[PDB]
Amino acid sequence: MPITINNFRYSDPVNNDTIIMMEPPYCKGLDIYYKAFKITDRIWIVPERYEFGTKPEDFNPPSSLIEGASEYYDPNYLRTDSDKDRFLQTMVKLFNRIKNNVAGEALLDKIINAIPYLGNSYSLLDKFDTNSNSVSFNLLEQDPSGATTKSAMLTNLIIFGPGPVLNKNEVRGIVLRVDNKNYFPCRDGFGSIMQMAFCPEYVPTFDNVIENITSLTIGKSKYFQDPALLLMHELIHVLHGLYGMQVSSHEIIPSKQEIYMQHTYPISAEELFTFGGQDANLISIDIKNDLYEKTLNDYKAIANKLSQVTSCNDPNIDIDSYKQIYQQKYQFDKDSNGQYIVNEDKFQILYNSIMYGFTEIELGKKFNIKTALSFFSMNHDPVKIPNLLDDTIYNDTEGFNIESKDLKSEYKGQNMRVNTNAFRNVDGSGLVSKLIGLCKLCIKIKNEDLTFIAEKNSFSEEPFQDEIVSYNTKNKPLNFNYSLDKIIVDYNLQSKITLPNDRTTPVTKGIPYAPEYKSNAASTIEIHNIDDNTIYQYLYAQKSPTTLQRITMTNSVDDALINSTKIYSYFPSVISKVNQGAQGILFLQWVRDIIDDFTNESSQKTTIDKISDVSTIVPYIGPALNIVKQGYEGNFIGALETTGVVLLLEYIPEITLPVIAALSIAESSTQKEKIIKTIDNFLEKRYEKWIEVYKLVKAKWLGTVNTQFQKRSYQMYRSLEYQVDAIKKIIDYEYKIYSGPDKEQIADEINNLKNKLEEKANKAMININIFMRESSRSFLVNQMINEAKKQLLEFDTQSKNILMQYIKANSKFIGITELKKLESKINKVFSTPIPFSYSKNLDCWEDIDVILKKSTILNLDINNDIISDISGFNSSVITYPDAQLVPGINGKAIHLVNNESSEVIVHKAMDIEYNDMFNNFTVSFWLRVPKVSASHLEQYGTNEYSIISSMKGSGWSVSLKGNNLIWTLKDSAGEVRQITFRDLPDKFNAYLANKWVFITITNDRLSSANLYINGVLMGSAEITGLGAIREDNNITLKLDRCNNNNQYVSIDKFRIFCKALNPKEIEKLYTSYLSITFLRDFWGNPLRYDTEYYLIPVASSSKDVQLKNITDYMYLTNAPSYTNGKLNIYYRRLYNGLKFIIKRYTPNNEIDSFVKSGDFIKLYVSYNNNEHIVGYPKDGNAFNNLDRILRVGYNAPGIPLYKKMEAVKLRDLKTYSVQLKLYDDKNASLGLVGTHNGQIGNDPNRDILIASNWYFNHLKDKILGCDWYFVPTDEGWTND
Ligand SMILES: CC(=O)N[C@H]1[C@H](O[C@@H]2[C@H](O[C@]3(C(=O)O)C[C@H](O)[C@@H](NC(C)=O)[C@H]([C@H](O)[C@H](O)CO)O3)[C@@H](O)[C@H](O[C@H]3[C@H](O)[C@@H](O)[C@H](O)O[C@@H]3CO)O[C@@H]2CO)O[C@H](CO)[C@H](O)[C@@H]1O[C@@H]1O[C@H](CO)[C@H](O)[C@H](O[C@]2(C(=O)O)C[C@H](O)[C@@H](NC(C)=O)[C@H]([C@H](O)[C@H](O)CO)O2)[C@H]1O
Ligand SMILES: [Zn+2]
């Protein structure tokens, strides 16, 4: 099964197998040849620049660009034989990186097995044809005596080096010339050779700025992209081409009218589907249907075409072998005659896998590579990566994000502020941009800084037309997605189908013409002469001079433009202070007053009562960006109250909809009885209209309105950078001039308060991004969708009077059968509106998995040390500097210490903010509290502190008081209801004594609220007759009012459901977090190699393990306990008995620290600062000759010692136990490790440690003597 990647050097000799001389498809007949190398099955690499269709002068750098983002040119790339070897070696490493993940293995396999059809729309119907440059290329094979021989070969993909532009990779199918037109077999369903132009060293860069999640220690930062994902991106385009499903219509065109508008290339639907995420909804649902239907016709044509094939131009090709392959590829069935047909259920799955399965965003996640979340995210200048062939920079299992260099965490290997050895800037000679001038003083602006705004005529109007319903009209699926996990699962189950030999007869039919290269070169810049000040002048006015000179801040934009030393600002309190030169006073108050003024100015928030949707408004947007209304100087909030959020948009969109044509009924015939399916269809197709029009509005919003709100954030980030940079330069001049005695000592505290600026500008961007994100949403959900609802209601009322005039016309066929009188009352459904869903369609009201997913409204997960919400409503999650990460139940958990900085804040999405008020909800999470000491119960036992809460006032909270766990509701009136859980006194079996436990708190309003722990009911309280609950916007995870400075907790899998869960649903939720893959220690954390552990038997938990002597046996003895009557606590003392260490039986270089079930291991006892092996000696003493007595550090000359053990988890999934299986020399089971009562030699009676196969016949017992706790020493448990 596993895919193989060939190795070679460019100098290696031609071998007529994996290294050949190729005549490429657009050199057909010309006898031009190039050395080419077979990377794997059906994929060739040609180390040459993509020159097809070009002139030599195209490769040189132009002065300016016509369209798009920046482009790097260099004619000398890939010129020499060293350059070509560098290219070849680098592509091999990138293919190896792809193969080393199962998601990339799966992608490669689909590509390889998707062979092009031998023929197309303009070939002979009865014949497989290989004579075409669309499916075959010629090659030259030399003999010993130099005697050449023309041959040919079928293939799927050929990879070349880049065209004129190095940083713009391309994928194209072969074009055919038919009746003086271009024909593409990769768009008709047949497929063809696909040709790639790829450059691995020159990569795009992006940033962090718009994202919902934010860490105050990460800040904002630029990242560069991993070339392997860039390769996979292009490979997805190849995959579409090979299945003949390439998409060329329905492009999104940018508007170019206004100056602020971005001049990009037209965005294809191909690129939006390939990238993935939310921006694939730029193509409306109705357009997705036309595409689906087009490919279905195409594949039907091919099914009929394939059925009629009886010969081929190649004698050697077995025809039946290819037909089985094409039936496999295209997912055809056979009918009873033997002709190939399209099974539509099978087609729907195939179609969805290819278009909507593999995306850049999903591959990013599987590979742990960072990507941008939006297609409109900002691009910066590209960088280059000179050392891809250095494993200290880039390796074939982790790329840049190497764990052994602490570069996996937070994608730091890609972060440009951290991993500075991995990249270098490109030299300016070859880098060209699209710039525009703004003259008033002329300033130049990069095209990358402008705003994309879509042309209106690029969106569909098919949903406003007349749809004719009949008896036999079908439903539109409305389902265009496919899980990448499902593709991997199916890939593993595949039987290994094998391709035919790919040599064929010589190729002569094609035409050696590539389409002409379309130049992006421009001679001049577009220059605009303007009267007034736009946003770009306001930002240019904030730029500091690149020189260490006296600087000042003014509130006049024109002052700052003209005067070099002066800078524009919108913070009055900060302007006052920085201009004032502090004379005769210490810097303490001087500098502090610069900082805590900037804090007070930058942190401003407010709300507008009239706008419910927007939780956060930042008033200083207007002055910073010149967003102001006539007769509202210094009054931004007044402008928002009157106009609304549309004030923020530079381009004001036309949000009207035309008349939605009412449905018509054409099925007049009532020849057959029960023609009531015509009534069903009409009602279905009415439901489809609402979804079609809703999604069309969403598409237009994304391309036209949301893009504007995104650029506001980027603009605000630039200004906050400029302002902060000005201040950090102001403060340095007054420090250099300062000639005081304290100067040398105070230097570190000055630089300490300059980092404090960055901290508060980051806190401001959190406010700003909330503001722009929620405003954009508000404008969609209110303004734009109301216009849809108006025309959708008009559409309904009209369409009923067509429906019921048809029921009246055929009224005599449905009476006297409970059908007519039933179906006036059925039109309650027609009276009800169909609601709009901005994010996730939630259903709070039989399959337990589906009920839980469908009702989840918040769900915290940690991936690569980033906490985020994976529920579907992407709530903002803010992680503060001293929130920490520790081992969790499946990954990592949040850890909270007792200081101001240790905090995680979840600002709820606007789609869910009032779900607490009147309705039921469940809260669930994993909890780990350390065992409270004797002293700390005396001191703090009274002190109640909260750990998680949503209180303003009104809300809910989770809290701890001594060894008691407390749930607390609280309404708007002030009424309080509570549950209190008293923890068990036996701390070895207690729920709040240093183990991971699963909490679940259901709330039914018309009943009681219940507390569960590990799926078991522990407390209850009556909620009935409690007022409406009005929460805070945020949910805080923090220790609050806790006097113990040493106190800490750990929280994992925080989750909120929009219903009250029943106990069957809680049982499934609890068990779903418990896997068999990784083993666990006594505390619930992952079991580890090379770590000391005390063993306790689960069946006799009061016992410790002891050693009679070295070279001898182990046995059980009682463990001391601790007791305390007045505090009501007792337990067996931990950390007595032997220490055990687990090591790998067969060690390897690169493995994890974690012990997986099924691992083969050696076990040692650590005694007297020495590690002695545990095992069974050959023919050694055993009870009943079957229960085999274990020995520690046994060594006799002749006798062997069996020591091979397997760490496994065979029973009792809820308990943190482990079993251990001993083997002999030849993989025969000597038994699981446990105990047996008896007497060795003349010793006393003891429970001696053994290995026995007896345990295998009692694995269903409640308590069993082969289950072991592995207990490490832990800070959260010490003996009193
Ligand atoms: C009871 C006993 O002594 N069992 C030990 C066993 O002895 C053999 C015979 O036992 C069976 C059995 O497993 O029950 C009888 C079955 O019919 C046999 N099944 C077959 C052939 O299909 C089965 C097999 O032969 C073996 O499993 C091997 O595959 O053995 C036992 O009945 C017999 O007893 C008599 C005999 O009838 C007469 O000739 C004469 O009166 O004397 C003998 C000796 O008593 O002898 C057989 C031996 O030749 O042999 C196995 C060897 O694998 C074990 O030693 C087994 O003892 C058990 O060993 C395990 C692992 O070492 C634990 O030590 C068990 O201890 C615990 C436990 O569950 O962990 C400790 C608990 O504290 C204890 N609880 C209490 C309250 O006492 C339990 C409890 O005794 C129960 O047995 C639990 O089910 O045991 C230990 O019992
Ligand atoms: Zn692309």
Q: 3-state secondary structure string, 885-953?
A: EEECCCCEEEEEECCCCCCEEEECCHHHCCCCCCCCEEEEEEEECCCCCHHHHHHHCCCEEEEEECCCC
**Would the annotation count 528 as a binding residue?**
no
Cα–Cα distance measured from residue 364 to residue 391, given in angstroms and rounded to the nearest whole number: 21
Query: b or e along 44-82 (b: 16 or more beta carbons within 10 Å of the residue's beta carbon)?
Result: bbbbbbbbbebeeebbebbebbebbbbbbbbeebbeeee
Nearest residue by C-alpha to atom 7 in ligand 1: 1184
Cα–Cα distance measured from residue 59 to residue 422, given in angstroms and rounded to the nearest whole number: 27
Pick from 1116, 1240, 1254 the residue to mutate for probing ligand 1's pocket: most ligand atoms within 8 Å of its CB.
Answer: 1254
Note whether 324 and 515 are within 8 A (CB). no
**Phi (first) and psi of residue 1173, to 5 degrees:** -65, 140
C-alpha dihedral, 453 to 456 to 459 to 464, nearest 10°: 150
Note whether 949 and 919 are within 8 A (CB). no
Map tokens 């070939």 to a residue.
123
Map tokens 């055929």 to a residue.
810
DSSP E strand boundaries for 237-376? 311-312, 332-334, 340-342
Cα–Cα distance measured from residue 109 to residue 92, given in angstroms and rounded to the nearest whole number: 17
Map tokens 């990769």 to a residue.
186
Query: What is the experimental method?
Result: X-ray
Map tokens 């994902």 to a residue.
229
Helix H segments across 1041-1082?
1063-1072
Instruction: Report the candidate in 884, 856, 883, 851 with the shortest Cα–Cα distance to residue 870.
Output: 856
Q: Which ligand is the nearest neighbour of the Cα of 170?
A: 2
Beta-strand pair 136-140/1008-1013:
unpaired
Instruction: Report the candidate in 1265, 1215, 984, 1278 with the shortest Cα–Cα distance to residue 1082.
Output: 1215
Q: Residue 1215 is which amino acid?
A: T
Name 491's bridge partners. Answer: none
Name 1191's bridge partners. Answer: 1175
| CA within 13 Å, CB half, 945 | 22
| Token pair of 234 as six digits | 């292009």
DSSP 174: P
270 contact partners, CB below 8 Å, separation of at least 6: 237, 240, 246, 247, 248
Distances in Å between the Cα of 1127 and the Cα atoms of 518, 933, 935, 962 are 84, 11, 10, 11
Provide the angle, in degrees to the nearest 10, between the axes of the packed helices 285-307 and 319-330. Answer: 160
| Token pair of 649 as six digits | 């948009």
| Token pair of 810 as six digits | 């055929």
Which region, left, alpha or beta, applies to residue 1257 given φ > 0 means left and ψ of -120 to 50 means alpha?
A: alpha
20 contact partners, CB below 8 Å, separation of at least 6: 14, 35, 36, 38, 139, 140, 141, 153
Q: For domain 848-1073, is the CATH number 3.40.50.2300? A: no
Q: Which residues are catalytic?
A: 234
947 contact partners, CB below 8 Å, separation of at least 6: 896, 958, 959, 960, 1037, 1038, 1039, 1040, 1049, 1051
Pick from 1098, 1181, 1187 the residue to mutate for probing ligand 1's pocket: most ligand atoms within 8 Å of its CB.
Answer: 1187
1052 contact partners, CB below 8 Å, separation of at least 6: 888, 889, 892, 893, 894, 925, 926, 928, 996
Map tokens 């998409």 to a residue.
247
Nearest residue by C-alpha to atom 8 in ligand 1: 1184
Nearest residue by C-alpha to atom 3 in ligand 1: 1184
3-state SS assignment for residue 815: coil
| DSSP line for 984-1034 | PSBGGG-TTSSS-EEEEEEE-TTSEEEEEETTEEEEEEE-SS-PPP---SE
| Closest ligand 1 atom to 1266 CA | 70
How many other C-beta atoms lie within 10 A of the C-beta of residue 18?
A: 15
Map tokens 């418990």 to a residue.
1074
How many other C-beta atoms lie within 10 A of the C-beta of residue 702?
A: 22
| Token pair of 916 as six digits | 């607490």
Instruction: Report the candidate in 448, 415, 431, 517 with the shortest Cα–Cα distance to residue 167.
Output: 431
| Closest ligand 1 atom to 1236 CA | 64
**CA dihedral (8, 11, 15, 19) positive or negative:** positive
Go through the chain and list every residue after which a break occurs, taking a C to next N gap over 2.5 angstroms, comma-separated: 440, 845, 952
Nearest residue by C-alpha to atom 70 in ligand 1: 1265
| DSSP line for 327-358 | HHHHTEEE-TTS-EEE-HHHHHHHHHHHHHTS
Beta-strand pair 34-40/19-23:
antiparallel
Note whether 19 and 12 are within 8 A (CB). yes
Q: Residue 1213 is which amino acid?
A: L
3-state SS assignment for residue 819: coil
Provide the angle, in degrees to the nearest 10, between the axes of the packed helices 81-99 and 227-242. Answer: 80
| Closest ligand 1 atom to 1250 CA | 62
Note whether 435 and 525 are within 8 A (CB). yes
Q: Which ligand is the nearest neighbour of the Cα of 359?
A: 2
Q: Which ligand is the nearest neighbour of the Cα of 1238?
A: 1
From the CA of 1202, how far away is ligand 1's center (Å)? Answer: 24
From the CA of 290, how far away is ligand 2's center (Å)? Answer: 22
Distances in Å between the Cα of 333 and the Cα atoms of 192, 249, 348, 498, 556 are 23, 30, 14, 20, 75
Cα–Cα distance measured from residue 1186 to residue 1254, given in angstroms and rounded to the nearest whole number: 8
Q: Which ligand is the nearest neighbour of the Cα of 238?
A: 2
| Token pair of 630 as six digits | 């006539």
551 contact partners, CB below 8 Å, separation of at least 6: 544, 545, 565, 566, 567, 726, 729, 730, 733
Which residues form ligand 1's pocket by a CB distance below 6 Å? 1183-1184, 1186-1187, 1234-1236, 1250, 1252, 1254, 1265
Measured between its terminal Cα atoms, the distance across the chain in Å is 58
| Closest ligand 1 atom to 1237 CA | 64
Note whether 1254 and 1187 are within 8 A (CB). yes
| Alpha carbon 37 to chain centroid, angstroms | 35
From the CA of 1184, how far away is ligand 1's center (Å)? Answer: 9
| Token pair of 362 as six digits | 């999903």
| Token pair of 213 as six digits | 């999640």
Cα–Cα distance measured from residue 410 to residue 218, given in angstroms and rounded to the nearest whole number: 8
Cα–Cα distance measured from residue 94 to residue 818, given in angstroms and rounded to the nearest whole number: 68
From the CA of 1176, how far away is ligand 1's center (Å)? Answer: 21
Cα–Cα distance measured from residue 616 to residue 913, given in angstroms and rounded to the nearest whole number: 14
Note whether 1024 and 886 are within 8 A (CB). no
Map tokens 């429970």 to a residue.
1247
Provide the angle, in degrees to the nearest 10, between the axes of the packed helices 1063-1072 and 848-855. Answer: 90
3-state SS assignment for residue 132: coil
Nearest residue by C-alpha to atom 61 in ligand 1: 1236
276 contact partners, CB below 8 Å, separation of at least 6: 359, 360, 361, 362
Instruction: Report the candidate in 1224, 621, 1276 with the shortest Cα–Cα distance to residue 886.
Output: 1276
Instruction: Report the candidate in 343, 390, 321, 373 with the shortest Cα–Cα distance to residue 213.
Output: 373
Cα–Cα distance measured from residue 850 to residue 842, given in angstroms and rounded to the nearest whole number: 11
Nearest residue by C-alpha to atom 78 in ligand 1: 1237
Cα–Cα distance measured from residue 334 to residue 321, given in angstroms and rounded to the nearest whole number: 16
| CA within 13 Å, CB half, 657 | 28
| Token pair of 787 as six digits | 């216009």
| Closest ligand 1 atom to 1187 CA | 62
Note whether 1140 and 1092 are within 8 A (CB). yes
DSSP E strand boundaries for 1004-1154? 1008-1013, 1016-1022, 1034-1040, 1048-1057, 1092-1097, 1103-1107, 1114-1118, 1121-1124, 1129-1132, 1139-1144
Instruction: Report the candidate in 192, 182, 228 with the shortest Cα–Cα distance to residue 369.
Output: 228
Distances in Å between the Cα of 829 and the Cα atoms of 683, 684, 1130 are 9, 11, 64
C-alpha dihedral, 108 to 113 to 117 to 118, nearest 10°: 110
Pick from 1098, 1103, 1181, 1186 the residue to mutate for probing ligand 1's pocket: most ligand atoms within 8 Å of its CB.
Answer: 1186
Query: b or e along 714-749 (b: 16 or more beta carbons within 10 Å of the residue's beta carbon)?
Result: bbbbbbbebbbebbebbbeebeeeeeeeeeeebeee
From the CA of 497, how far away is ligand 1's center (Å)? Answer: 53
Nearest residue by C-alpha to atom 27 in ligand 1: 1254
Note whether 869 and 1084 are within 8 A (CB). no
Cα–Cα distance measured from residue 1048 to residue 1259, given in angstroms and rounded to the nearest whole number: 38
831 contact partners, CB below 8 Å, separation of at least 6: none
The helix (run of H) or strand (run of E) holding residue 214 is strand 214-215
3-state SS assignment for residue 1051: strand
| Token pair of 899 as six digits | 């200081």
3-state SS assignment for residue 46: strand
Instruction: Report the candidate in 459, 466, 1261 with the shortest Cα–Cα distance to residue 798.
Output: 466
| Alpha carbon 983 to chain centroid, angstroms | 39
939 contact partners, CB below 8 Å, separation of at least 6: 1043, 1044
From the CA of 1256, how far away is ligand 1's center (Å)? Answer: 13
Q: C-alpha angle 419/421/422, rounded to 5°?
A: 75
Note whether 116 and 191 are within 8 A (CB). yes
How many other C-beta atoms lie within 10 A of the C-beta of residue 807?
A: 17
| Closest ligand 1 atom to 1254 CA | 53
Q: Which ligand is the nearest neighbour of the Cα of 1251?
A: 1
Cα–Cα distance measured from residue 949 to residue 961, given in angstroms and rounded to the nearest whole number: 15
| Token pair of 242 as six digits | 């090979």
Cα–Cα distance measured from residue 134 to residue 194, given in angstroms and rounded to the nearest whole number: 9
DSSP 555: S
Note whether 1105 and 1271 are within 8 A (CB). no
Instruction: Report the candidate in 1275, 1218, 889 with the shortest Cα–Cα distance to residue 1086.
Output: 889
Map tokens 């278009």 to a residue.
355
Q: C-alpha angle 865/871/876, rounded to 5°?
A: 60
How many other C-beta atoms lie within 10 A of the C-beta of residue 653?
A: 18
Beta-strand pair 136-140/127-128:
unpaired
Query: b or e along 588-604 (b: 16 or more beta carbons within 10 Å of the residue's beta carbon)?
Result: eebbebbbebbbebbee
**Phi (first) and psi of residue 756, to 5 degrees:** -65, -25
| Alpha carbon 931 to chain centroid, angstroms | 37
Cα–Cα distance measured from residue 722 to residue 1258, given in angstroms and rounded to the nearest whole number: 72
C-alpha dihedral, 614 to 617 to 622 to 625, nearest 10°: -80
DSSP E strand boundaries for 1077-1215? 1092-1097, 1103-1107, 1114-1118, 1121-1124, 1129-1132, 1139-1144, 1159-1166, 1171-1177, 1182-1183, 1187-1189, 1191-1192, 1201-1202, 1204-1208
Cα–Cα distance measured from residue 641 to residue 608, given in angstroms and rounded to the nearest whole number: 7
From the CA of 884, how far away is ligand 2's center (Å)? Answer: 38
Instruction: Report the candidate in 1150, 1199, 1149, 1153 with the shortest Cα–Cα distance to residue 1175.
Output: 1199
| Closest ligand 1 atom to 1257 CA | 27
| Alpha carbon 779 to chain centroid, angstroms | 27
The helix (run of H) or strand (run of E) holding residue 198 is none
Nearest residue by C-alpha to atom 48 in ligand 1: 1184
Helix (H) and strand (E) counts in the chain: 24, 65
DSSP 537: H
Map tokens 């901005």 to a residue.
838
From the CA of 41, how far away is ligand 2's center (Å)? Answer: 24
Note whether 128 and 154 are within 8 A (CB). no
Note whether 1087 and 1209 are within 8 A (CB). no
How many other C-beta atoms lie within 10 A of the C-beta of residue 1055?
A: 21
Name 1163's bridge partners. Answer: 1142
Note whether 1078 and 1155 are within 8 A (CB). yes
Name 340's bridge partners. Answer: 334
Q: Residue 494 is which amino acid?
A: Q
Map tokens 């059908």 to a residue.
819
**Would the annotation count 936 as a binding residue?**
no
